[PDB]
Amino acid sequence: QVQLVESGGGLVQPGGSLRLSCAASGYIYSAYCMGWFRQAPGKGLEGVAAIYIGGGSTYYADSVKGRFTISRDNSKNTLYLQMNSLRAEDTAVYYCAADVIPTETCLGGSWSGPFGYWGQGTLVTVSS
Amino acid sequence: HVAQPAVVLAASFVCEYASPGKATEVRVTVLRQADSQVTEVCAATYMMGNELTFLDDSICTGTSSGNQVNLTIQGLRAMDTGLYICKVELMYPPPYYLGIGNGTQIYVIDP
């Protein structure tokens, strides 16, 4: 039993920067793998980044590697996404996600799935 | 509520869950953290009322009854040493429920 609540999403100018907070309300630990997903206006759910909590290991989608970074501090028990240099293609509803799953599939870039714990989402509009 | 980790010795790890009864489809997964890597040991899906199980791997031995369902790994050896997580998922009907227990470290030796 784990609960998640995203925040920090809102209006930003294109080329700008913003970091999203996901406050985990349960017990996360080493075996857990946590990630960020986004739903584009028309398109379905895309995975942007994942972390293996235990290891330092991270995954990033081709579109966002070198601009987006994903962060975690056990002290706060909250996942962070730093979105740097935003774009018209980044604008979406960003969902927090956590599950204990094989590391190769967690960081494989194919995580996806309707399973695991999910956040309420946070809306990120960036354009004009 | 969530899975019950069990251990048998004098060498087996056992997840035990009590289904709500409402739930007709249940999946118990056993994963293992060892050497900076989490791994699926095995999974099994249980149709409650049909008391029928579908094992995703041959390594494990799933077993079902009226209310309670059980997934077992037997003959653990030195290399099987690691953290063992029980995962429990209520697939059908809604709502979808996930219960992930804190791992139980297993140390094995062979004289």
Short mmCIF file of C-alpha atoms in Angstrom, two decimals:
data_model
loop_
_atom_site.label_atom_id
_atom_site.label_comp_id
_atom_site.label_asym_id
_atom_site.label_seq_id
_atom_site.Cartn_x
_atom_site.Cartn_y
_atom_site.Cartn_z
CA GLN A 1 0.00 0.00 0.00
CA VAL A 2 1.67 3.25 -1.31
CA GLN A 3 0.09 6.63 -2.34
CA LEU A 4 1.66 9.26 -4.70
CA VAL A 5 0.81 13.00 -5.28
CA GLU A 6 2.53 15.06 -8.07
CA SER A 7 2.96 18.90 -7.88
CA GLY A 8 4.90 21.83 -9.46
CA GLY A 9 3.17 21.45 -12.89
CA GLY A 10 1.70 24.61 -14.50
CA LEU A 11 2.22 27.39 -17.12
CA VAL A 12 5.82 27.91 -18.49
CA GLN A 13 7.30 29.65 -21.63
CA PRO A 14 8.89 27.41 -24.32
CA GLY A 15 12.69 27.00 -23.77
CA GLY A 16 12.13 27.43 -19.98
CA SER A 17 12.75 25.05 -17.00
CA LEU A 18 10.66 23.39 -14.20
CA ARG A 19 11.08 20.50 -11.66
CA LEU A 20 8.10 18.24 -10.65
CA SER A 21 7.71 16.80 -7.08
CA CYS A 22 6.08 13.36 -6.39
CA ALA A 23 5.50 12.84 -2.60
CA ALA A 24 5.43 9.03 -1.95
CA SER A 25 3.01 8.28 0.98
CA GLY A 26 4.09 4.69 1.87
CA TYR A 27 7.32 2.62 2.33
CA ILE A 28 9.64 2.68 -0.75
CA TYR A 29 13.03 0.81 -0.51
CA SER A 30 15.94 -0.70 -2.57
CA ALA A 31 13.95 -3.30 -4.65
CA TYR A 32 11.43 -0.56 -5.74
CA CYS A 33 11.79 1.10 -9.18
CA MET A 34 10.15 4.57 -9.63
CA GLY A 35 9.61 6.54 -12.89
CA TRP A 36 7.87 9.50 -14.62
CA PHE A 37 5.31 9.11 -17.50
CA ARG A 38 3.48 11.74 -19.64
CA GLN A 39 0.21 11.73 -21.68
CA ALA A 40 0.44 14.01 -24.79
CA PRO A 41 -2.77 15.79 -25.96
CA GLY A 42 -3.80 13.15 -28.58
CA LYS A 43 -1.18 10.36 -28.07
CA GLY A 44 -1.41 7.76 -25.22
CA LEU A 45 0.97 7.27 -22.23
CA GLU A 46 4.78 7.58 -22.89
CA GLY A 47 7.60 6.77 -20.38
CA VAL A 48 10.08 9.72 -20.02
CA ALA A 49 12.46 8.42 -17.24
CA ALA A 50 12.84 5.61 -14.60
CA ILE A 51 15.17 4.96 -11.57
CA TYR A 52 16.23 1.72 -9.80
CA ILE A 53 15.93 3.09 -6.18
CA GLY A 54 18.56 0.56 -4.91
CA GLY A 55 21.19 1.41 -7.58
CA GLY A 56 22.13 4.79 -9.13
CA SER A 57 20.95 3.30 -12.49
CA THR A 58 18.58 5.60 -14.53
CA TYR A 59 16.78 5.35 -17.95
CA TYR A 60 15.82 8.32 -20.23
CA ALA A 61 13.66 8.44 -23.43
CA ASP A 62 15.62 9.53 -26.58
CA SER A 63 13.49 12.76 -26.80
CA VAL A 64 14.40 13.99 -23.23
CA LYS A 65 17.95 12.57 -22.51
CA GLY A 66 20.35 15.54 -21.91
CA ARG A 67 17.50 17.98 -20.93
CA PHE A 68 15.35 16.03 -18.36
CA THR A 69 16.89 14.56 -15.13
CA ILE A 70 15.14 12.35 -12.48
CA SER A 71 16.08 12.52 -8.72
CA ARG A 72 15.21 10.82 -5.35
CA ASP A 73 16.16 11.45 -1.66
CA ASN A 74 15.16 8.69 0.84
CA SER A 75 15.21 11.40 3.62
CA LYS A 76 12.16 13.23 2.08
CA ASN A 77 10.72 9.99 0.50
CA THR A 78 9.83 12.00 -2.68
CA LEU A 79 10.72 11.49 -6.40
CA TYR A 80 11.75 14.59 -8.48
CA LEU A 81 11.90 15.30 -12.27
CA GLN A 82 13.97 18.36 -13.40
CA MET A 83 12.70 19.40 -16.89
CA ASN A 84 15.33 21.73 -18.49
CA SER A 85 14.84 23.42 -21.95
CA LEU A 86 11.06 22.74 -22.43
CA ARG A 87 9.29 22.44 -25.85
CA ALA A 88 5.82 22.25 -27.58
CA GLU A 89 6.27 18.38 -27.62
CA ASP A 90 6.97 18.21 -23.81
CA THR A 91 3.52 19.77 -22.90
CA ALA A 92 1.48 16.88 -21.33
CA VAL A 93 -0.04 15.41 -18.08
CA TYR A 94 2.98 13.97 -16.13
CA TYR A 95 2.13 10.90 -13.95
CA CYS A 96 4.34 9.54 -11.09
CA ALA A 97 4.75 5.69 -11.01
CA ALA A 98 6.39 3.16 -8.59
CA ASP A 99 6.62 -0.71 -8.59
CA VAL A 100 9.01 -3.59 -7.60
CA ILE A 101 9.79 -5.04 -11.10
CA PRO A 102 12.86 -6.67 -12.80
CA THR A 103 15.68 -4.04 -13.23
CA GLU A 104 16.23 -4.92 -16.96
CA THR A 105 12.51 -4.09 -17.68
CA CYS A 106 12.47 -1.08 -15.24
CA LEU A 107 15.49 0.54 -17.06
CA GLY A 108 14.71 -1.33 -20.36
CA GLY A 109 12.62 1.69 -21.55
CA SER A 110 9.61 -0.65 -22.10
CA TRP A 111 8.25 -0.43 -18.48
CA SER A 112 4.80 1.01 -19.49
CA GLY A 113 1.94 -1.17 -18.10
CA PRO A 114 -1.34 -0.33 -16.29
CA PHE A 115 0.06 -2.11 -13.14
CA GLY A 116 1.94 -0.60 -10.14
CA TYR A 117 1.10 2.45 -7.95
CA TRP A 118 0.28 5.71 -9.89
CA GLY A 119 -0.12 9.40 -8.89
CA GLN A 120 -3.21 11.63 -9.56
CA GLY A 121 -1.09 13.40 -12.26
CA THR A 122 0.01 17.08 -12.69
CA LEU A 123 -0.80 19.20 -15.83
CA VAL A 124 2.20 20.87 -17.63
CA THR A 125 1.21 23.43 -20.36
CA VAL A 126 4.25 24.96 -22.23
CA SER A 127 3.77 26.87 -25.57
CA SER A 128 3.72 30.39 -27.21
CA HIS B 1 -4.40 -7.73 3.53
CA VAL B 2 -0.94 -8.21 1.82
CA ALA B 3 1.26 -11.34 1.23
CA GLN B 4 2.73 -13.41 4.15
CA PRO B 5 6.39 -14.42 3.55
CA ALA B 6 7.17 -17.93 5.00
CA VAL B 7 10.40 -20.06 5.10
CA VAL B 8 10.78 -23.89 5.48
CA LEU B 9 14.14 -25.45 6.60
CA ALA B 10 15.88 -27.90 9.05
CA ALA B 11 14.98 -25.03 1.98
CA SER B 12 11.84 -23.21 0.59
CA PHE B 13 10.37 -19.64 0.34
CA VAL B 14 6.51 -19.39 0.35
CA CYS B 15 4.12 -16.44 -0.33
CA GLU B 16 0.65 -16.95 1.31
CA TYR B 17 -2.32 -14.61 0.54
CA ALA B 18 -5.98 -14.78 1.76
CA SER B 19 -8.19 -13.55 -1.17
CA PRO B 20 -11.12 -11.19 -0.30
CA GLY B 21 -13.58 -13.58 -2.10
CA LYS B 22 -14.95 -10.71 -4.29
CA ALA B 23 -11.69 -10.95 -6.37
CA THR B 24 -11.93 -13.77 -9.03
CA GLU B 25 -8.43 -13.18 -10.62
CA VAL B 26 -5.25 -12.89 -8.42
CA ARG B 27 -1.50 -12.84 -9.41
CA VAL B 28 1.28 -13.57 -6.84
CA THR B 29 4.81 -12.62 -8.11
CA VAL B 30 8.07 -13.57 -6.25
CA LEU B 31 11.05 -11.25 -7.09
CA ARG B 32 14.65 -11.29 -5.68
CA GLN B 33 17.18 -8.45 -5.14
CA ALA B 34 20.77 -9.84 -5.34
CA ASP B 35 24.00 -8.14 -6.61
CA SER B 36 22.55 -4.64 -7.41
CA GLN B 37 19.70 -6.16 -9.53
CA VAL B 38 15.99 -7.06 -8.85
CA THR B 39 14.74 -10.15 -10.79
CA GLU B 40 11.44 -12.08 -11.24
CA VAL B 41 11.89 -15.60 -9.71
CA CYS B 42 8.36 -16.66 -10.83
CA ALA B 43 4.68 -15.54 -11.09
CA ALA B 44 1.35 -17.49 -10.96
CA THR B 45 -2.27 -16.35 -11.71
CA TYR B 46 -5.19 -17.90 -9.71
CA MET B 47 -8.87 -18.05 -10.87
CA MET B 48 -10.91 -18.08 -7.58
CA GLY B 49 -14.11 -20.23 -7.83
CA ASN B 50 -12.45 -22.29 -10.64
CA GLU B 51 -9.59 -23.09 -8.11
CA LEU B 52 -7.15 -23.21 -11.13
CA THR B 53 -3.54 -21.76 -11.25
CA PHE B 54 -1.31 -20.75 -14.26
CA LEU B 55 2.46 -20.77 -13.41
CA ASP B 56 4.55 -18.30 -15.55
CA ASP B 57 7.76 -20.28 -14.61
CA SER B 58 8.55 -24.03 -14.00
CA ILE B 59 11.01 -23.16 -11.12
CA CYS B 60 8.04 -22.47 -8.71
CA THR B 61 4.98 -24.56 -7.57
CA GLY B 62 1.69 -22.59 -7.22
CA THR B 63 -1.27 -24.11 -5.25
CA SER B 64 -4.90 -22.86 -4.75
CA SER B 65 -7.84 -23.54 -2.33
CA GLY B 66 -11.31 -21.96 -1.70
CA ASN B 67 -10.13 -18.66 -0.10
CA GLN B 68 -6.28 -18.84 0.22
CA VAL B 69 -3.60 -19.14 -2.57
CA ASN B 70 0.10 -20.12 -2.23
CA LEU B 71 3.29 -19.78 -4.42
CA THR B 72 6.43 -21.79 -3.41
CA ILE B 73 10.12 -22.10 -4.52
CA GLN B 74 11.86 -25.32 -3.23
CA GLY B 75 15.51 -26.54 -3.08
CA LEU B 76 17.23 -23.14 -2.52
CA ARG B 77 21.09 -23.29 -2.91
CA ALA B 78 24.01 -20.93 -1.98
CA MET B 79 23.59 -18.72 -5.13
CA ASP B 80 19.79 -18.30 -4.44
CA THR B 81 20.96 -16.18 -1.39
CA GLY B 82 19.25 -12.74 -1.69
CA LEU B 83 16.29 -10.51 -0.64
CA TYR B 84 12.88 -12.20 -1.37
CA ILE B 85 9.81 -9.94 -2.01
CA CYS B 86 6.18 -11.21 -2.10
CA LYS B 87 3.97 -9.17 -4.51
CA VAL B 88 0.12 -9.59 -4.62
CA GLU B 89 -2.14 -8.08 -7.35
CA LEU B 90 -6.01 -8.20 -7.47
CA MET B 91 -6.68 -8.14 -11.28
CA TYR B 92 -10.50 -8.72 -11.54
CA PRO B 93 -12.94 -7.42 -10.65
CA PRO B 94 -11.95 -3.76 -10.04
CA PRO B 95 -10.60 -2.06 -8.13
CA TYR B 96 -6.97 -3.09 -8.97
CA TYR B 97 -5.00 -3.61 -5.68
CA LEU B 98 -1.18 -4.00 -5.30
CA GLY B 99 0.51 -5.16 -2.03
CA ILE B 100 4.37 -5.32 -1.94
CA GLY B 101 5.84 -6.68 1.35
CA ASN B 102 9.23 -5.54 2.74
CA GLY B 103 11.78 -8.20 1.57
CA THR B 104 12.99 -11.09 3.84
CA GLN B 105 16.77 -11.73 3.36
CA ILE B 106 17.61 -15.49 2.84
CA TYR B 107 21.19 -16.82 3.51
CA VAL B 108 21.89 -20.43 2.26
CA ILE B 109 25.05 -22.63 2.79
CA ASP B 110 25.89 -26.24 1.67
CA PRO B 111 28.41 -28.36 3.68
#
